[PDB]
Design a protein around this motif. Structure first.
Motif, PDB file in Angstrom:
ATOM      1  N   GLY A 115       0.906  -1.255   0.028  1.00  5.84           N
ATOM      2  CA  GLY A 115       0.144  -0.006  -0.202  1.00  5.84           C
ATOM      3  C   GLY A 115       0.967   1.233  -0.047  1.00  5.84           C
ATOM      4  N   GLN A 116       1.744   1.205   0.907  1.00  4.51           N
ATOM      5  CA  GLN A 116       2.802   2.452   0.863  1.00  4.51           C
ATOM      6  C   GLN A 116       3.533   2.590  -0.499  1.00  4.51           C
ATOM      7  OE1 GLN A 116       5.634   2.477   3.947  1.00  4.51           O
ATOM      8  NE2 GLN A 116       6.731   4.237   3.163  1.00  4.51           N
ATOM      9  N   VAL A 117       4.062   1.606  -1.058  1.00  3.90           N
ATOM     10  CA  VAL A 117       4.942   1.718  -2.263  1.00  3.90           C
ATOM     11  C   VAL A 117       4.153   2.007  -3.423  1.00  3.90           C
ATOM     12  CG1 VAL A 117       6.577   0.462  -3.687  1.00  3.90           C
ATOM     13  CG2 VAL A 117       6.737   0.193  -1.367  1.00  3.90           C
ATOM     14  N   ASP A 118       2.890   1.612  -3.514  1.00  2.76           N
ATOM     15  CA  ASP A 118       1.960   1.821  -4.613  1.00  2.76           C
ATOM     16  C   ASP A 118       1.123   2.753  -4.226  1.00  2.76           C
ATOM     17  OD1 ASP A 118       0.648   1.084  -7.109  1.00  2.76           O
ATOM     18  OD2 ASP A 118      -0.907   0.459  -5.350  1.00  2.76           O
ATOM     19  N   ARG A 119       0.899   3.973  -5.040  1.00  2.00           N
ATOM     20  CA  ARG A 119       0.078   5.046  -4.788  1.00  2.00           C
ATOM     21  C   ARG A 119      -0.322   5.575  -6.215  1.00  2.00           C
ATOM     22  NH1 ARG A 119       3.626   7.170   0.107  1.00  2.00           N
ATOM     23  NH2 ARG A 119       4.823   6.235  -1.421  1.00  2.00           N
ATOM     24  N   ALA A 120      -1.677   5.835  -6.152  1.00  2.00           N
ATOM     25  CA  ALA A 120      -2.101   6.506  -7.485  1.00  2.00           C
ATOM     26  C   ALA A 120      -1.536   7.936  -7.738  1.00  2.00           C
ATOM     27  CB  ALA A 120      -3.575   6.673  -7.150  1.00  2.00           C
ATOM     28  N   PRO A 121      -1.525   8.420  -8.815  1.00  2.00           N
ATOM     29  CA  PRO A 121      -1.068   9.807  -9.239  1.00  2.00           C
ATOM     30  C   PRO A 121      -1.923  10.734  -8.517  1.00  2.00           C
ATOM     31  CG  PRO A 121      -0.920   8.354 -11.264  1.00  2.00           C
ATOM     32  CD  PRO A 121      -1.823   7.569 -10.135  1.00  2.00           C
ATOM     33  N   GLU A 122      -1.523  11.966  -7.966  1.00  2.00           N
ATOM     34  CA  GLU A 122      -2.374  12.977  -7.496  1.00  2.00           C
ATOM     35  C   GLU A 122      -2.949  14.114  -8.240  1.00  2.00           C
ATOM     36  OE1 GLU A 122      -3.473  12.982  -4.397  1.00  2.00           O
ATOM     37  OE2 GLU A 122      -2.447  10.930  -3.761  1.00  2.00           O
ATOM     38  N   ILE A 123      -3.910  14.558  -8.099  1.00  4.91           N
ATOM     39  CA  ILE A 123      -4.654  15.674  -8.811  1.00  4.91           C
ATOM     40  C   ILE A 123      -4.323  16.789  -8.115  1.00  4.91           C
ATOM     41  CG2 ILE A 123      -6.986  16.210  -9.531  1.00  4.91           C
ATOM     42  CD1 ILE A 123      -7.754  13.454  -8.723  1.00  4.91           C
ATOM     43  N   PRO A 124      -3.398  18.025  -9.168  1.00  9.48           N
ATOM     44  CA  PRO A 124      -3.358  19.186  -8.725  1.00  9.48           C
ATOM     45  C   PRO A 124      -4.404  20.249  -8.546  1.00  9.48           C
ATOM     46  CG  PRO A 124      -2.554  18.756 -10.942  1.00  9.48           C
ATOM     47  CD  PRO A 124      -3.315  17.414 -10.580  1.00  9.48           C
ATOM     48  N   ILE A 125      -5.108  20.066  -7.405  1.00  5.85           N
ATOM     49  CA  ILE A 125      -6.204  21.177  -7.082  1.00  5.85           C
ATOM     50  C   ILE A 125      -5.728  22.676  -7.548  1.00  5.85           C
ATOM     51  CG2 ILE A 125      -7.486  22.214  -5.429  1.00  5.85           C
ATOM     52  CD1 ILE A 125      -7.672  19.162  -4.082  1.00  5.85           C
ATOM     53  N   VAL A 126      -6.546  23.350  -8.469  1.00 10.36           N
ATOM     54  CA  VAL A 126      -6.319  24.601  -9.146  1.00 10.36           C
ATOM     55  C   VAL A 126      -7.359  25.375  -8.441  1.00 10.36           C
ATOM     56  CG1 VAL A 126      -5.554  25.618 -10.724  1.00 10.36           C
ATOM     57  CG2 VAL A 126      -5.367  23.605 -11.134  1.00 10.36           C
TER      58      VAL A 126
END
Lengths: 50, 49
Positions: free
Chosen positions: A12-23
């Protein structure tokens, strides 16, 4: 049967989804502002209109 | 609804969309107008005062 449990918790730690740059943008409402707040809260419902 | 502005944002599949627009084309027309509560008539008398 045990190395799996240890692999999952670590995975779970090593694998994370790409984050969404809130504008952020500022809107200057023309017309009422109570109605256009309610609109943007029934239409696109995760927008954080403040 | 977009507030009370007589606009209406409606949002669904295109089959429902082209059906509801055909119905609304039929059963939706502007309201009628009241006539009046007061009228005037003018009489040009010829023989009387």
């Amino acid at each position: 049967r045990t190395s799996v449990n240890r692999a999952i918790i670590l995975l779970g730690q090593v694998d994370r989804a790409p984050e969404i740059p809130i504008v952020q943008r500022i809107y200057t409402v023309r017309g009422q502002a109570a109605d256009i707040t309610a609109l943007l809260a029934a239409q696109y419902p995760t927008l954080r209109v403040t | 609804p977009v507030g009370q502005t007589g606009q209406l944002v409606l949002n669904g599949a295109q089959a429902q969309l082209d059906t509801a627009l055909a119905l609304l084309e039929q059963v939706d027309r502007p309201a009628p107008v009241a006539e009046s509560r007061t009228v005037q008539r003018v009489f040009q008398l010829v023989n009387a005062s």
